[PDB]
C-alpha cells in the first residue's frame with residue numbers, strides 16, 4: 036500500500052498528520068519501506084536510497 | 085598468448101572502463117548518509133516514534149530550497165496481515181524472530 | 182695492499198657518519214613536538230561553541246564552518262594592542278581567509294528533466310572556475326584576484342589540486358573588528374552552493390625559542406555535498422645564526438659539502454678507471470644514489486635559504502599578511518630528502534662488516550637466496566594485486582577502507598599483522614565479505630607466506646653445508 | 657631474576673635437556689652475528705621514522721619512542737591512521753617496506 | 757609569572773594500622789612554548805621496622 | 807597527615823636569551839628553557855618571606 | 857592552422873586510451 040507524501044511540503048504536513056491520526060500504521064505493522072531517489076548532475080550519478 | 089591478451093584487454097575495458105566514476109560514488113553515498121542522520125534511524129525501536137524522525141530530517145531534505153533534484157516524489161509501502169498476538173517477552177530470540 | 186685501502190675507505194666513511202649524525206641531531210629537538218602539539222590542541226580540539234561538541238576535525242556542513250569561524254577560531258587567535266597566543270607566541274601579521282569557487286552553468290544537465298533542475302556546478306577545475314564579481318562587489322572578497330598578483334601556488338589537497346587564486350580577505354589585528362568582518366561576510370552570503378574550497382592562513386613566532394610556525398587550515402566542499410577538513414602546522418626557522426651552536430652547525434654543513442665533493446670525485450675516478458660496467462654490483466649502485474640525493478638536498482637547501490625576501494618585506498611593514506607558505510613547502514621537501522639520504526647512508530654500513538667467517542657466511546646466505554626470493558615475490562605480489570583489485574571493485578564503494586587502491590594495499594598489509602578485523606565488510610556485504618576474508622587468510626597465511634621461510638631455510642642449510650665441505654676438503 | 661636463571665647450571669644434566677643447551681651454545685655466535693645486522697637495519701628505520709614523523713605522531717616524538725613503537729609494530733599494534741595523515745608520501749612507504 | 761618553569765607539591769602520610777609510610781609528590785611543568793605538563797609519584801615507604 | 811605540605815617553585819630570569827635584532831623593537835622580554843646557568847635568583851614581588 | 861591545437865580542456869583522465877597502449881607493450885615484450 037503506497038502513500039504519495041510529496042507535493043509542496045506545506046501540503047505534506049496534512050498527509051503526515053492524516054496518516055498519524057486516522058489509524059494507519061498499527062496492529063499489523065510488518066513493513067513501512069521508506070524509499071526515494073537521488074541525482075547529482077555534477078558527476079552524473081543517481082542513487083537508490 | 086595473443087588470444088589471452090585480447091581476452092584480458094576486453095575484460096579490463098569491461099571492468100575499469102569507467103573507473104573515474106568510482107571515487108565519486110563513495111563520497112556521494114557518504115554525503116547522502118550524513119545528511120539523513122544515518123545514526124538515529126538505525127537506533128529506532130518501535131515506540132510510535134518514526135514520525136518525529138520523518139518530520140524532522142526527511143521533509144526539509146526533500147522540499148528544501150537548496151535541496152536535491154530528487155528525481156520525483158518519495159513513497160511508503162506496507163505489507164501485512166493478522167497482527168502478532170504479543171509474542172513472549174522473556175528471553176527473546178536473538179535474530180530468529 | 183688491500184689493507185691500507187680498506188682501512189682508508191673505512192675511516193673516511195666513519196667520519197662522514199659522525200658528521201651526518203651531528204648535522205641531523207640539531208634539526209630535531211624536543212621543543213618542536215610540544216610547540217606543535219599545543220597549537221594543534223588549541224585549534225583542532227576546541228568545540229565550536231560552549232553548547233556544541235563538534236570541532237574542526239568533525240565538521241559536517243557549511244553551517245558548522247560559519248560557527249567555527251566566528252567562534253573557536255577567534256577565541257584562539259586574539260588573547261588579551263597585540264595578541265600573544267599562549268602569552269608567549271606572537272601572532273605576527275594578519276590572518277587571511279580565501280575562497281575558491283566554480284561558475285554557474287558549467288556542466289550539462291540533460292534535456293528531458295531540465296524543467297526541474299535549474300543549475301549545476303561542476304567539480305573543481307581550472308577551466309571551470311568563476312572569475313566574475315559576485316554579490317555586493319565591494320572589496321577584495323568579491324573580486325577575483327589572479328594567482329600572480331596574489332603570490333600563491335598550488336596546494337594538492339584531498340579531492341583535487343587547487344590553484345593559488347580566488348576571492349581573499351585579510352582579517353584585522355584585534356578581535357572586535359575581525360568578528361565584525363566575519364559577520365558582514367556571513368550576512369551578504371559568501372559561501373553559496375558554488376564554493377569549492379576555503380583556506381585560512383596565519384603564522385606565529387614564539388621568541389623564547391627562535392622558531393616560527395606557519396598554520397594553514399583547509400575545508401573542501403565536494404560537488405557531491407559534504408565537508409572535508411584538513412590542517413597543517415609547520416615549525417620554520419629563518420633567523421638561524423644567533424647562537425654558537427648554530428655556527429657549529431653551519432661549519433658541519435660546509436664540511437658535509439666537502440665530503441660530498443670528495444665522494445663524487447672518487448666515484449668518477451672509479452668509473453673511469455679499470456672498468457665501465459661499474460653498474461653491475463649492488464654496492465656500486467648505492468654510492469651513486471647517495472651522491473645524487475646529497476646533491477639534490479644541497480641544491481634545495483641553497484635555493485630555499487637564499488630567498489628570504491618575504492621575511493624582510495614583512496619586517497618592513499608589520500600590518501600585512503606574512504607569506505611563508507613556499508618556505509614551509511620547501512622545508513618539508515628538504516626534510517624528506519634528508520631522511521631518505523640518512524637511511525641509505527646507514528644501510529651502506531653493510532659493505533664493511535665482513536671481518537670474520539661467521540659474518541661472511543651470513544652475507545653469502547643473504548646474497549645467494551635473493552635470486553629465489555625475487556622469483557617468488559613476483560608470483561606473490563601478482564596474487565596480492567589480484568586480491569586488491571577485487572576488493573577495490575567490490576567493497577570500494579561503501580567501506581572507506583578499500584575506497585582507493587592504495588587503501589586496499591595498506592589494508593591487506595594490515596590484515597597480515599592481524600590488525601584489521603571483519604566488522605565493516607560484513608555490513609557492506611554479509612555474503613562476499615566472509616568469503617573474501619576467509620579465502621585471503623587461508624591463501625596468504627597457511628600457504629603463500631610460509632614459502633618464503635622454506636626458501637630461506639633451505640638456502641641457509643645448503644650454504645653452510647657446502648662451505649663446511651669445502652673447508653674440510655681443501656683445508 | 658639472575659638467580660632464577662642460574663638453575664640451568666644444574667637442570668641440564670640429563671639427555672633431552674643437554675641437547676637444547678648445546679643447541680643454544682653452538683649457535684650463540686651466529687645469533688649475535690645476525691643480531692648485529694638486524695639491529696643496524698632496525699636503527700636505520702627508527703632514525704628515518706624519527707626524522708619524518710618526529711613532530712606530529714606522539715609515538716615517534718623521541719628516539720626511544722621510535723624504537724619501542726617499532727618493537728610494537730611487530731606484535732601487530734599500530735594505528736596507521738596518524739602515520740598516513742602525517743605524511744601521505746613516504747609514510748605508507750615506510751610502513752610497507754618495514755613490514756615486508 | 758611567565759618566568760615560572762616548574763612547581764612541586766610534597767607531603768606524607770602514615771596509616772598506623774599497617775606500619776607503612778607513603779610519600780606523595782606532584783609536579784607541574786610549564787614549557788617555554790606555553791602549556792602545562794603534570795606528573796605524580798606515590799611511594800609507599802617503610803621506615804619503622806622490628 | 808604528617809607535618810605540613812610544602813609548595814615550591816623554579817623560575818628563569820628575564821632576558822636569559824637573545825632576541826634577533828630585526829624585531830627587537832617588537833618583543834620586549836624573553837625567558838629561556840630551564841637550565842641551571844639561566845635560573846633567576848633575585849627577589850620579586852612583595853619580598854616579605856620565603 | 858586552427859586545425860591542430862593543444863586542447864587541455866578538462867582534467868578528466870581517460871583510461872580507455874592508456875589501457876589499450878599498456879597491453880600492446882606487455883604483449884610485445886612477452887612475444
Ligand SMILES: *[C@@H]1O[C@H](CO)[C@@H](O)[C@H](O)[C@H]1NC(C)=O
Nearest residue numbers: 284285286287298299300301
Ligand atoms: C545559473 O545559470 C542558469 C543558466 O544555465 C540560470 O537559468 C540560473 O538562473 C542561474 N542561477 C543563478 C544565477 O543562481
Ligand SMILES: *[C@@H]1O[C@H](CO)[C@@H](O)[C@H](O)[C@H]1NC(C)=O
Nearest residue numbers: 316317318319320365368369
Ligand atoms: C560596501 O562598502 C561600503 C563602504 O565601503 C559599506 O558602507 C557598505 O555597507 C558595503 N556593503 C554593501 C553596500 O552592501
Ligand SMILES: *[C@@H]1O[C@H](CO)[C@@H](O)[C@H](O)[C@H]1NC(C)=O
Nearest residue numbers: 330331332490491494502504
Ligand atoms: C604579492 O607581492 C609582494 C609580496 O612579496 C607584495 O608587495 C604584494 O602586495 C603581494 N600581493 C598581495 C595581494 O599581497
Ligand SMILES: *[C@@H]1O[C@H](CO)[C@@H](O)[C@H](O)[C@H]1NC(C)=O
Nearest residue numbers: 819820821822833834835836
Ligand atoms: C626584561 O628585560 C628587558 C631588558 O632586557 C626590559 O626591557 C623588560 O622591560 C623586562 N621585562 C620585565 C617584565 O621586567
Ligand SMILES: *[C@@H]1O[C@H](CO)[C@@H](O)[C@H](O)[C@H]1NC(C)=O
Nearest residue numbers: 849850851852853854855856
Ligand atoms: C607583606 O608584609 C607582611 C609580612 O611581612 C604581610 O602581613 C603583608 O600582608 C604582606 N603584604 C602584602 C602581601 O601586600
